[PDB]
C-alpha cells in the first residue's frame, strides 16, 4: 500500500490549514496514523500519534483525525504561525510493512520578502600559492527562496567554473546560498575585476573584487 | 529523557558491507519495538526495518529484504543494522527510532550518514578569507575546499565565538567533491587586536585544521 | 503442565500457546508464545491498534541457575 | 526489580502495580508481587471497560504461588 | 462437563451462623470468578455475593454486607459462603455460579435450601398408601423444615411416579405424598418400596407398600 | 446500585414472536453485558443468552438478544414460539461492583387444550390409625389451566374443619398438580359411612369416594 499527501499546502498567519493523507489499499481505520514534523537539518519530531494523541510540548493547535470512508487521515493546524513552516509526513502500517507518505511542505503566506545580503571574497594568497583561484560569493537572508547568480569578468559574462548551491531555508525562514567561481591564477590576474551578480525578483545586487594591488 | 544515539555510518564502496548501532537510554529497552528509517539527501522518509522487543519478530522493507539484518542486544540497550551488498541508492541518513507498538514510532535519534560510492575519501584544504578594509563591520571567513564525503564541522576560536557566525551549506561540484565556506561578522575595530581562528573538522578523513585569518597587509 | 490448571492462555485478548521444554530440576518447563501480533478484540478479530507481548519471569532452576521464561502474554496499547 | 527491566506493567490494557515482599529467612529474600490496577481493561478510548477483566497471571516458583503480571480476558472466543 | 455441587444447607436459628460449600469440577477453577445467588420460595433470583479467581477481590449485595463473607480454596476446588447473624429473610435456595468475567454467569449449581427459623427440627413419619392400572404411594407427614427426598424401589422405579409438592399446615409443619401408577397385576409379583429421606433430621425410611 | 425492570408476564400463541424487555434504571446499559436466564419450575436457572447476544451451543436459534441504548433497555425475543418455551425468564447485568437480576417474567403459551383433573383418593393407613391419627389424601394431577376448587364431604354434609390444600403447581408437561389433606380423628373416620374429595375445574366436577373398611 501507499500513502498520498499533497506536495505543498499554503495559508496565511492565524488561519486553519489541513494536510491530508490517503491510503491506496487496506483499511486506514485498522492501523494507527502518525504525524511528524521535520525542520531543515533536523530529526523528525512527533506531532501526532495513534490518530489524535498529542504529546506534551506540542501546542493544541495541532490535531489529527481519521475518515474511515474516504480512507484518509488529516492533520489540522489552526491559528497558523510562521514557526509552523516545515515538512510534514504521515505514517501508518499493516501487520508487516510500515509506510511513510511523501511529505507535505507547509508554506505560510504573506511573509515580508527581503533582498539578499551578498559578500564576495577574492582568492587567497594561500590558494594562489597552490596554483588555484576560487571566488566565493555568499548570499544570505533573502525571501522567497529563488535566486539567480551571474558572474562577470570585467563587463563580460563568465561561462565556465560556476557552481551554485540550491537555496536552503535557514531558521528565520529566509534563505541562504553560495556560488563559487573557479579560475586559473592567470585569469584572475589578467582581468581588472570580477563581479558576483545575484538576481532576486528581477532586482540585482552586485559585488566586485580585484587582484590585490595598489 | 528518551535518548537514541546512532553510530557506525560512513563511506563504503558499492557491494560493500557496514554495521550501524543505536545505543538507547532513558527507558526500559527490551519492552520496546524498534525500527530504522532512512532519508536520502533532499528526499523523503523511507522505512527500512523493524524488530519486536524480544527480537523474535523481524520486519524489512522490500528494497532491503535479504541484504539487511536488524537485531538487538537487549542486555546492552543496543539495536543493530547489518547492511550487506550495499548500493548507491542505499546512500542516506539512517535514523533509529522507538515504537510503542509495531508501526507507531514515538522518538527519533539524530541520525548517521551512510555514503555508498566508489569515490575515495579526500580531506579538505582550508583557506583563510581575509576581511576587506572598507556600519563598522567586517566579514572574515574560512574556505573549506574539495573534500569527500560529508560532513565538515566548523567553529571559530574553539567555539568561544558564536555571534555573527554563518556556516554555509556545502556545494557539490561536478568533480564529485564538496566545498563550503564559513563567515563571521566582526567589528572592524577588533581587526588589529583580536585573533580569529577557524577550526575545521573532517572526521571522515580524520583531519583537523586550525587556521588564523588575518587582514591582508 | 499449566493449561490443565489455568484457562487464561485461551480466554486472553492476547492468547498464547505453550511449548514443551525438557532437560535439570524442574526437568520440564513450559514456555509461553503469543498466538498473535495483534490482540483479539470485542468481536473476535485481530486488532492491530495493540500488540501481544510475553511477560517474562526470572525463575531459579538447578548448582543454582536463574533463567528467563515467558509466563504468558499481555496486551499493550499506545494510548495512555 | 521488574519495574525497571520491563515497562509493560504500565502500558498494558490490564496494567498492574508491584508490591515488595521481603522475607529474611527466604531466598530470594525479595520477591515482587503483581496486583492488577483495575477490574476492567483499558480500551481504545483510554477508559476502563467492563466488557472484559484484568486478571493476574499466577506462577509456581521455587524457594510458592506468585502473581507475575496481568492479562485481559473476555467472555467471548 | 461443568459441575457445581452446593452443600451445607439446613436449619439455622435467627441471629445464627451457617457455612455453605460448593465443590466445582469440569473446568480450571482458579481462572473463574464465582458468585452466590439466592432465591426465596416462590420469589425472584437475587444476587448475593461474588469473588475473583484469585480470591483477592470481594463483592456483596447491600442486604448482606458485613454479615456474609465469601471465600475460596483453589487447591481444594471449593467455594464458600460464611453466613453470620441470619434473619428470617435469608431463607432461600442458595446457588453456586461460575463467571466468565465479573457479572457474566455461565453455569449454575443445583442449589441448597437455607431455612432461618426458630422452629424445631421434626422428622416425618411415613405412612403407606394401600391400593383398593392401580395406584399406591407414601404419605410423608408432619416434617420441618424442607426438603424431603422420595424415590421408589431404591431408585429403579421412575415410571408413573408422581411426587406432589408439599403442603404447609397452619401448625407450621409440612406434609407431602408420592404416588405410583403400576399395572393392576403386580400385587403378588412386584415389591414396591418408597425411599423417604429427610436430611435435616437424619431420617431415612424405606417402605414396602402392599394390599 | 440500580434496578432492572421487566414485565411480570408476557403471553403469545404457538408460532408467534414474543418480546421480553428489561429496563436498566441508572448507568449506561451498553457499558455492561446483559445475560438471560430460563428457569423451568423446580429447576436451576439455565442460560439462554450471555454477553448481549451470544448463544450457547445447545440453545435453539429462535432465542436471540439485543440492546437498546436510547431506552437504556435490553430485550430477549423468541420467534416461532413453542409450548416447551413456557417458563420464567430473568435478565441480568452488573456494574463495577454490583450484579443485578430483574424481577423475572412468566411466559405463557396461549391456546393450550383444556384438561380435566385426574384424582386419586386414599383412606388413612392401618398404621396411621394405630397412631390415633387420620389423614385422607386427595391427589389432583394433569389439569389445565392451573386453577382448581376442592371440597370435602362427610357422608353428604360439607366440612371445612381440617382441610389443607396446596396452591396449584406447574408440571414439566405444562399441566398442573395440587393436593388436599383432610385431618380427622379415628372416631370421625369410623363415625361416618363415607368420605369424598370433590375437585371442580372450569365447571366440571370429578369426585372420588372412600369409606372405612
> What's the number of CA atoms in the CB half-sphere (13 Å) around residue A156?
5
Q: How many CB atoms lie within 10 A of CB A111?
A: 15
Which CATH architecture is the domain F1-111 placed in?
Answer: Sandwich (2.60)
Nearest to E101 among D35, D56, D75 (CB): D75
3-state secondary structure string across E121-173: CECCEEEEECCCCEEEEEEEEEEECCCCEEEEHHHCECCCEEECCCEECCCCC
**CA A48 to CA A56: how far, in whole Å?**
10
**CA D71 to CA A203: how far, in whole Å?**
70
Please report, for chain D, the start and end positions of each structural domain, with discontinuous segments joined by +: 1-77
Looking at the structure, tell me whether residues E72 and E136 fall in a common domain. no
**Do F36 and D54 touch, CB atoms closer than 8 A?**
no
Chains contacting A (3+ CB pairs below 8 angstroms): B, C
Residue C50 distance to chain B (closest CA, Å): 7
The three cell numbers of residue E19 are 457455612
**Do B19 and B123 touch, CB atoms closer than 8 A?**
no
**Widest CA span of chain D, in angstroms?**
46
Looking at the structure, tell me whether residues E127 and E89 fall in a common domain. no
- Give how far the C-alpha of residue E200 lies from the chain's centroid of Cα atoms, to the nearest Å: 10
Residue in A with minimal Cα distance to C45: A30
- Measured between beta carbons, the chain C residues lying within 8 angstroms of A50 are 49, 78-79
Please report, for chain A, the start and end positions of each structural domain, with discontinuous segments joined by +: 1-110, 111-211
Pairing outcome for strands B153-156 and B197-202: antiparallel
**CA B167 to CA B169: how far, in whole Å?**
7
Which CATH architecture is the domain D1-77 placed in?
Answer: Ribbon (2.10)
> Do F1-111 and F112-212 come out as alike in CATH topology?
yes
Residue F101 distance to chain E (closest CA, Å): 6
**CA A104 to CA A34: how far, in whole Å?**
14
Contact F99 E50 (CB under 8 A): yes
**Do E168 and E144 touch, CB atoms closer than 8 A?**
no
- Last residue of one domain, picked from the residues E87, E118, E149: E118
Q: By C-alpha distance, which of E53, E170, E150 is closest to E100?
A: E53
Q: C18 and chain D: CB distance < 8 Å anywhere?
A: no
The domain defined by C1-80 carries CATH number 2.10.90.10:
yes
Sequence-ordered strand ranges (E) for chain F: 4-5, 9-12, 18-24, 35-39, 46-49, 63-68, 73-78, 87-94, 99-101, 105-109, 118-122, 134-143, 149-154, 157-159, 163-165, 169-170, 176-184, 195-201, 204-210
Contact D72 C6 (CB under 8 A): no
Looking at the structure, tell me whether residues E6 and E81 fall in a common domain. yes
Looking at the structure, tell me whether residues E21 and E102 fall in a common domain. yes
Could you identify the residue written with the cell 473476535? Answer: C44
**CA E53 to CA B67: how far, in whole Å?**
50
Residue D32: φ, ψ to 5°: -100, 115
Looking at the structure, tell me whether residues E58 and E131 fall in a common domain. no
Range of the domain at B169: 119-217
Looking at the structure, tell me whether residues B156 and B109 fall in a common domain. no
Contact A95 C49 (CB under 8 A): no
Q: Could you tell me the fold of the domain covering F112-212? A: Immunoglobulin-like (2.60.40)
Q: In chain B, how many domains are there?
A: 2
Looking at the structure, tell me whether residues E151 and E185 fall in a common domain. yes
Q: What is the resolution of this structure in A?
A: 2.6
Residue C22 distance to chain D (closest CA, Å): 17
Q: Could you tell me the fold of the domain covering A1-110? A: Immunoglobulin-like (2.60.40)
- Last residue of one domain, picked from the residues E74, E97, E118: E118
Looking at the structure, tell me whether residues E105 and E158 fall in a common domain. no
Give the DSSP letter of residue E96. Answer: E
Task: Among 2.60.40.1080, 3.30.365.10, 2.60.40.10, 1.25.40.340, name the CATH number for the domain at A111-211.
Answer: 2.60.40.10
**Do B126 and B209 touch, CB atoms closer than 8 A?**
yes
- Last residue of one domain, picked from the residues E65, E90, E118: E118
**Do A117 and B137 touch, CB atoms closer than 8 A?**
no
**Do E201 and E177 touch, CB atoms closer than 8 A?**
no
- Measured between beta carbons, the chain E residues lying within 8 angstroms of C7 are 27-28, 31-32
**Do A9 and A105 touch, CB atoms closer than 8 A?**
yes
Q: Where residue E184 sits, what CATH number does that domain have?
A: 2.60.40.10
Looking at the structure, tell me whether residues B58 and B124 fall in a common domain. no
Residues 6+ apart with CB under 8 A from F102: E44, F4, F5, F6, F22, F90, F91, F92
Q: By C-alpha distance, which of E80, E150, E163, E86 is closest to E117?
A: E86
**CA A40 to CA B75: how far, in whole Å?**
35
Residue F208: φ, ψ to 5°: -110, 145
Residue spans of alpha helices (H) in chain A? 125-128, 185-190
The angle formed by the CA atoms of residues A202, A203 and A206, to the nearest 5 degrees, is 130
CA distances from F66 to C45, F74, F96 (A): 20, 6, 21
Amino acid at each position: 500500500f501507499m500513502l498520498t499527501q499533497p506536495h505543498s499546502v499554503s495559508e496565511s498567519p492565524g488561519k486553519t490549514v489541513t494536510i491530508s493523507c490517503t491510503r491506496s489499499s487496506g483499511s486506514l481505520a485498522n492501523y494507527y496514523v502518525q504525524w511528524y514534523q521535520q525542520r531543515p537539518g533536523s530529526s523528525p519530531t512527533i506531532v501526532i500519534f495513534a490518530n489524535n494523541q498529542r504529546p506534551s510540548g506540542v501546542p493544541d493547535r495541532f490535531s489529527g483525525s481519521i475518515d474511515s470512508s474516504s480512507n484518509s487521515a488529516s492533520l489540522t493546524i489552526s491559528g497558523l504561525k510562521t514557526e509552523d513552516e516545515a515538512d510534514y509526513y504521515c505514517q501508518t502500517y499493516d501487520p508487516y510493512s510500515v509506510v511513510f507518505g511523501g511529505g507535505t511542505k507547509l508554506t505560510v503566506l504573506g511573509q515580508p520578502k527581503a533582498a539578499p545580503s551578498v559578500t564576495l571574497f577574492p582568492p587567497s594568497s594561500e590558494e594562489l600559492q597552490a596554483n588555484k583561484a576560487t571566488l566565493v560569493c555568499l548570499i544570505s537572508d533573502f525571501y522567497p527562496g529563488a535566486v539567480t547568480v551571474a558572474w562577470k569578468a570585467d563587463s563580460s559574462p563568465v561561462k565556465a567554473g560556476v557552481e551554485t548551491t540550491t537555496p536552503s531555508k535557514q531558521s528565520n525562514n529566509k534563505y541562504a546560498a553560495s556560488s563559487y567561481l573557479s579560475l586559473t591564477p592567470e585569469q584572475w590576474k589578467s582581468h581588472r575585476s570580477y563581479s558576483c551578480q545575484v538576481t532576486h525578483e528581477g532586482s540585482t545586487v552586485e559585488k566586485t573584487v580585484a587582484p590585490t594591488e595598489c | 529523557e528518551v535518548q537514541l544515539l546512532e553510530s557506525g555510518g560512513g563511506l563504503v564502496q558499492p557491494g560493500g558491507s557496514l554495521r550501524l548501532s543505536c545505543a538507547a537510554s532513558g527507558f526500559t529497552f527490551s519492552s520496546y519495538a524498534m525500527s530504522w528509517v532512512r532519508q536520502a539527501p533532499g528526499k523523503g522518509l523511507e522505512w527500512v526495518s523493524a524488530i519486536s522487543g524480544s527480537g523474535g519478530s523481524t520486519y524489512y522493507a522490500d528494497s532491503v529484504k535479504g541484504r539487511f539484518t536488524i537485531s538487538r542486544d537487549n542486555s546492552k540497550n543496543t539495536l543493530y543494522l547489518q547492511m550487506n551488498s550495499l548500493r548507491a541508492e542505499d546512500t542516506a541518513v539512517y535514523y533509529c527510532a522507538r515504537d510503542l507498538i509495531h508501526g507507531v514510532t514515538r522518538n527519533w535519534g539524530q541520525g548517521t550518514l551512510v555514503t555508498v560510492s566508489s569515490a575515495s575519501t579526500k580531506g579538505p584544504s582550508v583557506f583563510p578569507l581575509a576581511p576587506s578594509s572598507k556600519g563598522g563591520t567586517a566579514a572574515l571567513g574560512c574556505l573549506v575546499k574539495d573534500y569527500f564525503p560529508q560532513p565538515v564541522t566548523v567553529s571559530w576560536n574553539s567555539g568561544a565565538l558564536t555571534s555573527g557566525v554563518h556556516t554555509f551549506p556545502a556545494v557539490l561540484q561536478s568533480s564529485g567533491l564538496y566545498s563550503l565556506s564559513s563567515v563571521v561578522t566582526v567589528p572592524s575595530s577588533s581587526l588589529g587586536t583580536q585573533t580569529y581562528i577557524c577550526n575545521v573538522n573532517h572526521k571522515p578523513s580524520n583531519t583537523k585544521v586550525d587556521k588564523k585569518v588575518e587582514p591582508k597587509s | 503442565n499449566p493449561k490443565r490448571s489455568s484457562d487464561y492462555y485461551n480466554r486472553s485478548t492476547s492468547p498464547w500457546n505453550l511449548h514443551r521444554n525438557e532437560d535439570r530440576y524442574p526437568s520440564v518447563i513450559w514456555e509461553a508464545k503469543c498466538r498473535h501480533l495483534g490482540c483479539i478484540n470485542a468481536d473476535g478479530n485481530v486488532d492491530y491498534h495493540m500488540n501481544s507481548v510475553p511477560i517474562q519471569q526470572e525463575i531459579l532452576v538447578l548448582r543454582l541457575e536463574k533463567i528467563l521464561v515467558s509466563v504468558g502474554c499481555t496486551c499493550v496499547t499506545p494510548i495512555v
